[PDB]
C-alpha cells in the first residue's frame, strides 16, 4: 500500500532564489534554499493523492515555520526560538490532490544555521495533516545566513610573548576581525633566541562551547596547520605570515546564541624545538560573513 | 591587481645579529667507559663533556666523571621539584648482576655501549629543557666534579 498522501512544499520564488550548502556528519553536503532575517517565506503545500478510491479523514491541516536549536542529539532538549503557524484547512476529508497557499510576512530569523558536534541550529517549514492516531508530517529545510558589514573598530593584534631567558617573540596579525574569505597578514619577530627551533606553524582552531554555567562542554577541532617557518632563526629575524581563510571554509563566530552555545575561532601560534618540545600562544579572532555588495 | 602581495613592514636585521654566532649552542657527550674498583665494589664511569654559550651555565666548557647512580640521582631530584615530565633512563639492569651468566654481566661491551648511548640520549633532552635549566641539580650534575 505505502502512504495514502504525500506532502510537497514549493516556494513561490523556487527558480530565482539562491541555494546554499551545509557540511553534515561523515562528509555529506546538503543543499537548501537560502534566507535572510526579515525575508517573507511563501509558497504552496501540494498534497498528491496516491490511493484513488480511498479517503483521508483529518482534524485539520497546518503549516509552521520553525527555527530551533538541538543539543546532544536529544529530542527532549530541542528549543524552538521561532514558531509561526498558518492553518490551511478545517477538519474535513480529502479524496483527490489539492494545493494550499501560505505566506509568512517578514519572518524574523535571528540566528545563522549551524551543524556541529553537540549542537544543531536549523530552520524548516513543517506541514502537519492531523489524523485520529498518527499525523502525516513533512519537514522542508532552509539555510539562513546572517550578514554583517565592515566593523567600526578593527585593531591589529600585537603582543610580546616568551619563555624567560630562552625565547622572546613579538607576533602581529593585521586585524582582530576577519571575513570568511579574508587573509591573515602578519609577522613574527625574534627578540631573543636561546633555543634550537625546528619549525613554527600557525593553526586555526575552532571551539564549540555548549551548555550553561558549570554545565559546559567544549569540542575543539584544529581546522588548519600552516607552517610559517622552517629552521632556527636568530634575533632580529622577521617572518612573514600570509594565511588565506578561503582554503578552509570556516563558519562565522557565533557568541552565546540563544544563551545555549558558542562557536569561536583562535589563531594558535606553535613553535617546536629540536627535541620536539612545543611552545604556543592562542589568540581569538572574530570571523564574520561579509554582506555582498 | 592580479596577486595579493601584502606583507607587514619589517625592521632590517642588524648585521651583528645576522652574522654573529647563534646563542643556542649546547652539546653534551657521554663517552669513554672505565671500570673503577676491583672485585665486588666495581662500577662503570663515563666522561660527561659539555660545550655551551648559554649564560645560565657557569662554565663554557667542562669535563666530569659520572656513575649510573648519579644519573638516577639527577632524575629523582628533577621529578620532585622541577614539574618537568622527565624522560626515561636506559634502565636498571638487575638480572645482569646475577652470577654465572653467559656474558660479562654488567661489564658486557654491547651492554655498556647501549647504556652509554642511552645516557647521552637522556642528558641532552634534560639539559636542553627550559624549566630544567633553572634547577640547581643539573648544574651540580654537569659541571661540579663531584655531586
Amino acid at each position: 500500500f505505502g502512504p495514502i498522501c504525500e506532502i510537497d512544499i514549493v516556494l513561490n520564488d523556487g527558480e530565482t532564489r539562491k541555494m546554499a550548502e551545509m557540511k553534515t556528519e561523515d562528509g555529506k553536503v546538503e543543499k537548501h534554499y537560502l534566507f535572510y532575517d526579515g525575508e517573507s517565506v511563501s509558497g504552496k503545500v501540494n498534497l498528491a493523492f496516491k490511493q484513488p478510491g480511498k479517503r483521508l479523514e483529518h482534524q485539520g491541516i497546518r503549516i509552521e515555520f520553525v527555527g530551533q536549536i538541538e543539543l546532544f542529539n536529544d529530542k527532549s532538549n530541542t528549543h524552538e526560538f521561532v514558531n509561526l503557524v498558518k492553518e490551511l484547512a478545517l477538519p474535513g476529508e480529502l479524496t483527490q490532490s489539492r494545493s494550499y497557499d501560505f505566506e509568512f510576512m517578514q519572518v524574523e530569523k535571528p540566528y545563522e544555521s549551524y551543524i556541529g558536534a553537540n549542537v544543531r541550529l536549523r530552520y524548516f517549514l513543517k506541514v502537519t495533516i492531523v489524523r485520529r492516531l498518527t499525523d502525516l508530517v513533512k519537514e522542508y529545510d532552509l539555510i539562513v545566513h546572517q550578514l554583517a558589514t565592515y566593523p567600526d573598530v578593527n585593531n591589529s593584534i600585537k603582543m610580546e610573548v616568551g619563555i624567560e631567558d630562552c625565547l622572546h617573540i613579538e607576533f602581529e596579525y593585521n586585524k582582530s576581525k576577519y571575513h570568511l574569505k579574508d587573509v591573515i597578514v602578519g609577522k613574527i619577530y625574534f627578540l631573543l633566541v636561546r633555543i634550537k627551533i625546528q619549525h613554527m606553524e600557525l593553526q586555526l582552531i575552532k571551539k564549540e562551547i555548549t551548555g550553561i554555567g558549570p554545565s559546559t562542554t567544549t569540542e575543539t577541532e584544529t581546522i588548519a596547520k600552516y607552517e610559517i617557518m622552517d629552521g632556527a632563526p636568530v634575533k632580529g629575524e622577521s617572518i612573514p605570515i600570509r594565511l588565506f581563510l578561503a582554503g578552509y571554509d570556516p563558519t562565522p563566530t557565533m557568541r552565546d546564541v540563544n544563551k545555549k552555545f558558542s562557536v569561536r575561532y583562535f589563531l594558535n601560534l606553535v613553535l617546536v624545538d629540536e627535541e620536539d618540545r612545543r611552545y604556543f600562544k592562542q589568540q581569538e579572532i572574530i570571523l564574520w560573513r561579509k554582506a555582498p555588495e | 591587481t592580479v596577486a595579493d602581495t601584502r606583507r607587514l613592514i619589517t625592521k632590517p636585521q642588524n648585521l651583528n645579529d645576522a652574522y654573529g654566532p647563534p646563542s643556542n649552542f649546547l652539546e653534551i657527550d657521554v663517552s669513554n667507559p672505565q671500570t673503577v674498583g676491583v672485585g665486588r665494589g666495581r662500577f662503570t664511569t663515563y666522561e660527561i663533556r659539555v660545550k655551551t654559550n648559554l649564560p645560565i651555565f657557569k662554565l663554557k666548557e667542562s669535563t666530569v666523571r659520572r656513575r649510573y647512580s648519579d644519573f638516577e640521582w639527577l632524575r629523582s631530584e628533577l621529578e620532585r621539584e622541577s614539574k618537568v615530565v622527565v624522560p626515561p633512563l636506559p634502565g636498571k639492569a638487575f638480572l645482569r648482576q646475577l652470577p654465572f651468566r653467559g656474558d660479562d654481566g654488567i661489564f658486557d661491551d654491547n651492554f655498556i655501549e647501549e647504556r652509554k648511548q642511552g645516557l647521552e640520549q637522556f642528558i641532552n633532552k634534560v639539559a636542553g629543557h627550559p624549566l630544567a635549566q633553572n634547577e640547581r641539580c643539573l648544574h651540580m650534575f654537569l659541571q661540579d666534579e663531584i655531586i
Binding site: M159, E160, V161, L167, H168, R278, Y279 | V84
Partner: peptide
C-alpha cells in the same frame, strides 16, 4: 606525550 608550554606575556619590558 608531547610537552606543551604556554608562552607568557611580557609586561613593560623593552628591547
Amino acid at each position: 606525550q608531547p610537552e606543551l608550554y604556554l608562552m607568557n606575556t611580557m609586561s613593560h619590558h623593552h628591547h
